[PDB]
PDB file of C-alpha atoms and ligand atoms in Angstrom:
ATOM      1  CA  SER A   1      25.129  -0.453  17.028  1.00 19.88           C
ATOM      2  CA  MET A   2      26.574  -3.736  15.575  1.00 17.16           C
ATOM      3  CA  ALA A   3      25.717  -6.039  18.909  1.00 17.08           C
ATOM      4  CA  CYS A   4      22.301  -5.161  18.441  1.00 16.82           C
ATOM      5  CA  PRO A   5      20.985  -4.384  15.298  1.00 19.80           C
ATOM      6  CA  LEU A   6      17.147  -4.527  16.298  1.00 20.93           C
ATOM      7  CA  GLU A   7      18.433  -1.672  18.393  1.00 28.03           C
ATOM      8  CA  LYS A   8      19.968   0.405  15.704  1.00 26.56           C
ATOM      9  CA  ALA A   9      17.206  -0.073  13.540  1.00 23.27           C
ATOM     10  CA  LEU A  10      15.030   1.942  16.086  1.00 20.88           C
ATOM     11  CA  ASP A  11      17.475   4.580  16.167  1.00 19.84           C
ATOM     12  CA  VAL A  12      17.135   5.195  12.232  1.00 19.53           C
ATOM     13  CA  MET A  13      13.377   4.620  12.441  1.00 18.95           C
ATOM     14  CA  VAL A  14      13.752   8.300  14.850  1.00 19.61           C
ATOM     15  CA  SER A  15      16.140   9.991  13.135  1.00 24.46           C
ATOM     16  CA  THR A  16      15.682   9.611   9.590  1.00 26.68           C
ATOM     17  CA  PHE A  17      11.726  10.542  10.062  1.00 26.17           C
ATOM     18  CA  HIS A  18      13.501  14.171  11.760  1.00 25.48           C
ATOM     19  CA  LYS A  19      16.123  14.099   9.619  1.00 24.54           C
ATOM     20  CA  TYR A  20      13.588  15.951   6.891  1.00 25.89           C
ATOM     21  CA  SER A  21      10.328  16.356   9.164  1.00 28.75           C
ATOM     22  CA  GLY A  22      12.091  19.680  10.743  1.00 28.89           C
ATOM     23  CA  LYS A  23      13.737  20.671   7.175  1.00 28.28           C
ATOM     24  CA  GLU A  24      10.354  23.319   6.999  1.00 28.31           C
ATOM     25  CA  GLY A  25       6.959  23.861   8.546  1.00 30.89           C
ATOM     26  CA  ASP A  26       5.914  22.064  11.555  1.00 30.26           C
ATOM     27  CA  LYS A  27       9.125  20.350  12.713  1.00 32.31           C
ATOM     28  CA  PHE A  28       7.874  17.237  14.133  1.00 32.53           C
ATOM     29  CA  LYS A  29       5.296  16.190  11.179  1.00 30.82           C
ATOM     30  CA  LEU A  30       6.558  15.603   7.387  1.00 31.21           C
ATOM     31  CA  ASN A  31       4.650  17.680   4.901  1.00 32.11           C
ATOM     32  CA  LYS A  32       4.260  16.561   1.086  1.00 36.00           C
ATOM     33  CA  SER A  33       7.591  18.126   0.399  1.00 35.81           C
ATOM     34  CA  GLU A  34       9.775  16.574   3.044  1.00 39.92           C
ATOM     35  CA  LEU A  35       7.870  12.823   2.145  1.00 39.10           C
ATOM     36  CA  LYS A  36       9.136  13.294  -1.048  1.00 40.14           C
ATOM     37  CA  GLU A  37      12.900  13.500   0.143  1.00 38.60           C
ATOM     38  CA  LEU A  38      12.802  10.739   2.819  1.00 36.10           C
ATOM     39  CA  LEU A  39      11.423   8.390   0.289  1.00 35.26           C
ATOM     40  CA  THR A  40      13.880   9.426  -2.289  1.00 35.46           C
ATOM     41  CA  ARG A  41      16.701   9.254  -0.399  1.00 35.49           C
ATOM     42  CA  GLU A  42      16.274   6.690   2.191  1.00 36.55           C
ATOM     43  CA  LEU A  43      14.297   4.258   0.536  1.00 35.57           C
ATOM     44  CA  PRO A  44      15.245   4.334  -2.846  1.00 37.24           C
ATOM     45  CA  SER A  45      14.084   0.817  -3.958  1.00 35.80           C
ATOM     46  CA  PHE A  46      10.725   1.585  -2.667  1.00 34.49           C
ATOM     47  CA  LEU A  47       9.968   4.334  -5.403  1.00 34.28           C
ATOM     48  CA  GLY A  48      11.808   3.231  -8.241  1.00 36.70           C
ATOM     49  CA  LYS A  49      11.724   6.292 -10.829  1.00 33.47           C
ATOM     50  CA  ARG A  50       8.012   6.933  -9.864  1.00 34.63           C
ATOM     51  CA  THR A  51       6.939  10.835  -9.490  1.00 34.86           C
ATOM     52  CA  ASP A  52       3.617  10.655 -10.826  1.00 36.09           C
ATOM     53  CA  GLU A  53       2.572  13.247  -7.885  1.00 38.58           C
ATOM     54  CA  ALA A  54      -0.999  12.243  -8.173  1.00 40.92           C
ATOM     55  CA  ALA A  55       0.074   8.592  -7.011  1.00 42.30           C
ATOM     56  CA  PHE A  56       1.974  10.910  -4.576  1.00 38.39           C
ATOM     57  CA  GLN A  57      -1.145  13.099  -3.495  1.00 39.22           C
ATOM     58  CA  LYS A  58      -2.638   9.550  -3.014  1.00 38.15           C
ATOM     59  CA  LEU A  59       0.201   8.214  -1.005  1.00 37.92           C
ATOM     60  CA  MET A  60       0.145  11.327   1.093  1.00 39.64           C
ATOM     61  CA  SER A  61      -3.496  11.186   1.855  1.00 38.72           C
ATOM     62  CA  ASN A  62      -3.652   7.468   2.489  1.00 39.26           C
ATOM     63  CA  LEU A  63      -0.761   7.614   4.940  1.00 38.26           C
ATOM     64  CA  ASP A  64      -2.624  10.785   6.488  1.00 40.14           C
ATOM     65  CA  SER A  65      -5.212   9.197   8.738  1.00 44.58           C
ATOM     66  CA  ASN A  66      -6.177  12.234  10.946  1.00 45.42           C
ATOM     67  CA  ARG A  67      -6.610  14.569   7.728  1.00 48.42           C
ATOM     68  CA  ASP A  68      -4.237  17.296   8.927  1.00 49.60           C
ATOM     69  CA  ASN A  69      -2.026  17.462   5.804  1.00 50.89           C
ATOM     70  CA  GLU A  70       0.816  16.318   7.451  1.00 47.67           C
ATOM     71  CA  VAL A  71       2.543  12.834   8.299  1.00 48.92           C
ATOM     72  CA  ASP A  72       3.362  12.615  12.207  1.00 46.96           C
ATOM     73  CA  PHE A  73       5.694   9.835  13.844  1.00 47.37           C
ATOM     74  CA  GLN A  74       2.610   7.855  14.280  1.00 45.05           C
ATOM     75  CA  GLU A  75       1.454   7.399  10.873  1.00 43.90           C
ATOM     76  CA  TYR A  76       5.203   7.168  10.121  1.00 44.31           C
ATOM     77  CA  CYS A  77       5.546   4.048  11.898  1.00 42.90           C
ATOM     78  CA  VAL A  78       2.480   2.853  10.189  1.00 40.39           C
ATOM     79  CA  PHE A  79       3.736   3.233   7.144  1.00 37.17           C
ATOM     80  CA  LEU A  80       7.052   1.708   7.837  1.00 35.84           C
ATOM     81  CA  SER A  81       4.990  -1.648   9.470  1.00 34.75           C
ATOM     82  CA  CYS A  82       2.851  -1.746   6.301  1.00 36.94           C
ATOM     83  CA  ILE A  83       6.290  -2.214   4.302  1.00 40.04           C
ATOM     84  CA  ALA A  84       7.829  -4.752   6.496  1.00 40.66           C
ATOM     85  CA  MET A  85       4.503  -6.598   6.799  1.00 42.04           C
ATOM     86  CA  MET A  86       4.908  -7.293   3.444  1.00 42.35           C
ATOM     87  CA  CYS A  87       8.503  -7.902   3.474  1.00 44.37           C
ATOM     88  CA  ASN A  88       7.712 -10.679   5.965  1.00 47.47           C
ATOM     89  CA  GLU A  89       4.869 -12.262   3.538  1.00 46.72           C
ATOM     90  CA  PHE A  90       7.236 -12.234   0.381  1.00 48.24           C
ATOM     91  CA  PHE A  91       9.818 -13.362   2.789  1.00 50.02           C
ATOM     92  CA  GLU A  92       7.305 -16.517   3.178  1.00 50.92           C
ATOM     93  CA  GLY A  93       6.809 -16.295  -0.937  1.00 52.46           C
ATOM     94  CA  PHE A  94       3.223 -14.602  -1.272  1.00 53.60           C
ATOM     95  CA  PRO A  95       3.183 -14.491  -4.651  1.00 51.84           C
ATOM     96  CA  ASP A  96       4.867 -18.282  -5.539  1.00 51.06           C
ATOM     97  CA  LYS A  97       2.884 -20.109  -2.638  1.00 53.78           C
TER      98      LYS A  97
ATOM     99  CA  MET B   1      -3.840 -22.522 -21.023  1.00 55.23           C
ATOM    100  CA  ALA B   2      -1.280 -22.100 -23.801  1.00 55.78           C
ATOM    101  CA  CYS B   3      -0.072 -18.760 -22.812  1.00 55.31           C
ATOM    102  CA  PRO B   4       0.017 -18.004 -19.177  1.00 53.42           C
ATOM    103  CA  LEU B   5       0.161 -13.800 -19.359  1.00 51.46           C
ATOM    104  CA  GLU B   6      -3.447 -14.341 -21.261  1.00 52.92           C
ATOM    105  CA  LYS B   7      -4.981 -16.579 -18.279  1.00 52.88           C
ATOM    106  CA  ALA B   8      -3.834 -13.661 -16.069  1.00 54.04           C
ATOM    107  CA  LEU B   9      -5.763 -11.061 -17.965  1.00 53.31           C
ATOM    108  CA  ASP B  10      -8.895 -13.301 -18.491  1.00 52.75           C
ATOM    109  CA  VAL B  11      -8.619 -14.191 -14.619  1.00 53.03           C
ATOM    110  CA  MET B  12      -8.431 -10.878 -13.303  1.00 53.22           C
ATOM    111  CA  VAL B  13     -11.554  -9.743 -15.400  1.00 57.46           C
ATOM    112  CA  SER B  14     -13.287 -12.805 -13.831  1.00 59.35           C
ATOM    113  CA  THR B  15     -12.286 -12.513 -10.620  1.00 59.45           C
ATOM    114  CA  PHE B  16     -13.771  -9.259 -10.027  1.00 61.49           C
ATOM    115  CA  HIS B  17     -17.300  -9.946 -11.902  1.00 61.53           C
ATOM    116  CA  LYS B  18     -16.770 -13.364  -9.333  1.00 62.29           C
ATOM    117  CA  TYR B  19     -17.893 -10.858  -6.666  1.00 62.08           C
ATOM    118  CA  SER B  20     -19.409  -7.627  -8.446  1.00 62.00           C
ATOM    119  CA  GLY B  21     -22.364  -8.986  -9.314  1.00 64.52           C
ATOM    120  CA  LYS B  22     -23.495 -10.272  -5.999  1.00 64.68           C
ATOM    121  CA  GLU B  23     -24.464  -6.868  -4.251  1.00 63.96           C
ATOM    122  CA  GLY B  24     -25.959  -3.821  -5.676  1.00 63.89           C
ATOM    123  CA  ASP B  25     -23.843  -2.425  -8.527  1.00 63.26           C
ATOM    124  CA  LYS B  26     -22.914  -5.377 -10.727  1.00 64.24           C
ATOM    125  CA  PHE B  27     -19.752  -3.740 -12.381  1.00 62.30           C
ATOM    126  CA  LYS B  28     -18.592  -2.133  -8.749  1.00 61.41           C
ATOM    127  CA  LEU B  29     -17.359  -4.083  -5.470  1.00 59.82           C
ATOM    128  CA  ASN B  30     -18.775  -3.168  -1.918  1.00 58.37           C
ATOM    129  CA  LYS B  31     -17.199  -3.413   1.367  1.00 58.87           C
ATOM    130  CA  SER B  32     -18.543  -6.833   1.657  1.00 58.49           C
ATOM    131  CA  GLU B  33     -17.245  -7.988  -2.041  1.00 59.49           C
ATOM    132  CA  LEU B  34     -14.012  -6.650  -1.503  1.00 63.12           C
ATOM    133  CA  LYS B  35     -13.621  -8.263   1.436  1.00 61.79           C
ATOM    134  CA  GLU B  36     -15.000 -11.803  -0.158  1.00 62.06           C
ATOM    135  CA  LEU B  37     -12.622 -11.096  -2.908  1.00 59.02           C
ATOM    136  CA  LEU B  38      -9.238 -10.519  -1.046  1.00 58.48           C
ATOM    137  CA  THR B  39      -9.795 -13.348   1.826  1.00 56.01           C
ATOM    138  CA  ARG B  40     -10.765 -15.858  -0.762  1.00 54.76           C
ATOM    139  CA  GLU B  41      -8.617 -15.088  -3.836  1.00 56.35           C
ATOM    140  CA  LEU B  42      -6.019 -13.393  -2.403  1.00 56.83           C
ATOM    141  CA  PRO B  43      -4.906 -15.229   0.990  1.00 57.75           C
ATOM    142  CA  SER B  44      -1.620 -14.930   1.133  1.00 54.89           C
ATOM    143  CA  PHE B  45      -1.978 -11.178   0.822  1.00 57.38           C
ATOM    144  CA  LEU B  46      -3.499 -10.628   4.254  1.00 58.08           C
ATOM    145  CA  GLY B  47      -2.203 -12.727   6.818  1.00 55.92           C
ATOM    146  CA  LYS B  48      -5.664 -13.698   8.950  1.00 55.88           C
ATOM    147  CA  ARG B  49      -5.686  -9.689   9.543  1.00 53.79           C
ATOM    148  CA  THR B  50      -9.176  -9.278  10.560  1.00 52.69           C
ATOM    149  CA  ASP B  51      -9.044  -5.342  11.468  1.00 52.75           C
ATOM    150  CA  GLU B  52     -12.000  -4.028  10.241  1.00 52.80           C
ATOM    151  CA  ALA B  53     -10.711  -0.747  11.199  1.00 52.54           C
ATOM    152  CA  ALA B  54      -7.941  -1.492   8.980  1.00 52.84           C
ATOM    153  CA  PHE B  55      -9.925  -3.157   6.005  1.00 52.14           C
ATOM    154  CA  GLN B  56     -11.913   0.349   6.174  1.00 56.47           C
ATOM    155  CA  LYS B  57      -8.824   2.246   5.546  1.00 59.85           C
ATOM    156  CA  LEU B  58      -7.869  -0.005   2.462  1.00 59.66           C
ATOM    157  CA  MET B  59     -11.647   0.462   1.038  1.00 60.79           C
ATOM    158  CA  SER B  60     -10.757   4.322   1.085  1.00 61.17           C
ATOM    159  CA  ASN B  61      -7.308   4.104  -0.021  1.00 64.67           C
ATOM    160  CA  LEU B  62      -8.808   2.039  -2.906  1.00 64.50           C
ATOM    161  CA  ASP B  63     -11.783   4.398  -3.369  1.00 63.26           C
ATOM    162  CA  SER B  64     -10.170   7.068  -5.390  1.00 63.93           C
ATOM    163  CA  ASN B  65     -13.045   8.705  -6.777  1.00 61.99           C
ATOM    164  CA  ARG B  66     -15.138   8.455  -3.211  1.00 61.06           C
ATOM    165  CA  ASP B  67     -18.157   6.630  -4.593  1.00 62.02           C
ATOM    166  CA  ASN B  68     -18.107   4.019  -1.498  1.00 60.72           C
ATOM    167  CA  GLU B  69     -17.217   1.428  -3.750  1.00 59.88           C
ATOM    168  CA  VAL B  70     -14.101  -0.193  -6.140  1.00 60.66           C
ATOM    169  CA  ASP B  71     -14.919  -0.219  -9.811  1.00 60.71           C
ATOM    170  CA  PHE B  72     -12.564  -2.196 -12.065  1.00 61.13           C
ATOM    171  CA  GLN B  73     -10.240   0.765 -12.802  1.00 58.86           C
ATOM    172  CA  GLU B  74      -8.909   1.243  -8.930  1.00 53.77           C
ATOM    173  CA  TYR B  75      -9.383  -3.055  -8.931  1.00 51.26           C
ATOM    174  CA  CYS B  76      -6.421  -2.828 -11.903  1.00 52.87           C
ATOM    175  CA  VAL B  77      -4.462  -0.068  -9.738  1.00 51.38           C
ATOM    176  CA  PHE B  78      -4.161  -1.978  -6.789  1.00 51.93           C
ATOM    177  CA  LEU B  79      -3.110  -5.018  -8.202  1.00 51.98           C
ATOM    178  CA  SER B  80      -0.646  -3.415 -10.230  1.00 53.16           C
ATOM    179  CA  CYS B  81       0.303  -1.706  -7.133  1.00 54.21           C
ATOM    180  CA  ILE B  82       0.961  -5.025  -5.255  1.00 54.84           C
ATOM    181  CA  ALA B  83       2.363  -6.844  -8.645  1.00 49.88           C
ATOM    182  CA  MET B  84       4.902  -3.845  -8.815  1.00 50.63           C
ATOM    183  CA  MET B  85       6.153  -4.679  -4.829  1.00 51.35           C
ATOM    184  CA  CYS B  86       6.653  -8.324  -5.845  1.00 48.22           C
ATOM    185  CA  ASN B  87       9.018  -7.255  -8.684  1.00 47.15           C
ATOM    186  CA  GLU B  88      11.137  -5.111  -5.993  1.00 47.77           C
ATOM    187  CA  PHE B  89      11.404  -8.177  -3.682  1.00 47.94           C
ATOM    188  CA  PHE B  90      12.133 -10.362  -6.628  1.00 46.11           C
ATOM    189  CA  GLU B  91      14.875  -7.892  -7.308  1.00 45.78           C
ATOM    190  CA  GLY B  92      16.184  -7.463  -3.606  1.00 40.65           C
ATOM    191  CA  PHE B  93      14.296  -4.438  -1.878  1.00 41.63           C
ATOM    192  CA  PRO B  94      15.799  -4.956   2.239  1.00 40.02           C
ATOM    193  CA  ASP B  95      18.264  -7.280   1.204  1.00 37.40           C
TER     194      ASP B  95
HETATM  195 CA1   CA C   1       7.610  19.441   8.841  1.00 33.53          CA
HETATM  196 CA1   CA C   2      -1.420  13.170  10.090  1.00 36.09          CA
HETATM  197 CA1   CA C   3     -21.374  -5.340  -6.441  1.00 34.30          CA
HETATM  198 CA1   CA C   4     -14.731   3.912  -6.536  1.00 34.98          CA
END
């Protein structure tokens, strides 16, 4: 847990996904309803107030690459990687350098 | 010039037309003009990522009206989305 923080990160990546994907419908994929709870309860700093729905449909449409109205674990990792790639750039001072 | 927030509004309008008037519609960006604007005007936004498949995804994620182009409205939405994100790390997102 503490002796390997990078391992604990991969745990909460798989567990947080299934924390909501199994609430309704396909137990292995996130619908628009489950994508809303996961981002709200687990990534609160990312959203802010938000709740524009249309932008949520845009976010749901951008993540859903295969166009099946769901977010599988593949697209779930791409979205997290895109956020981490930004956290890396702003660590290097993107808007100020 | 004298006011920085004013020049910020001026550069966003001029930078858009700095590339939109090159090919086709004079007021809408195509995929080539969008790539010139991102690489030349926002280099640190994309760390020299050359993935054409991923660049097309950003092109479709911005083309909200599905006209294969990026007008000024979608140009402002994308810039505000970036600015809103800069704000989160300023305040302290994973930190
Ligand atoms: Ca589900
Ligand atoms: Ca999907
Ligand atoms: Ca054009
Ligand atoms: Ca458009």
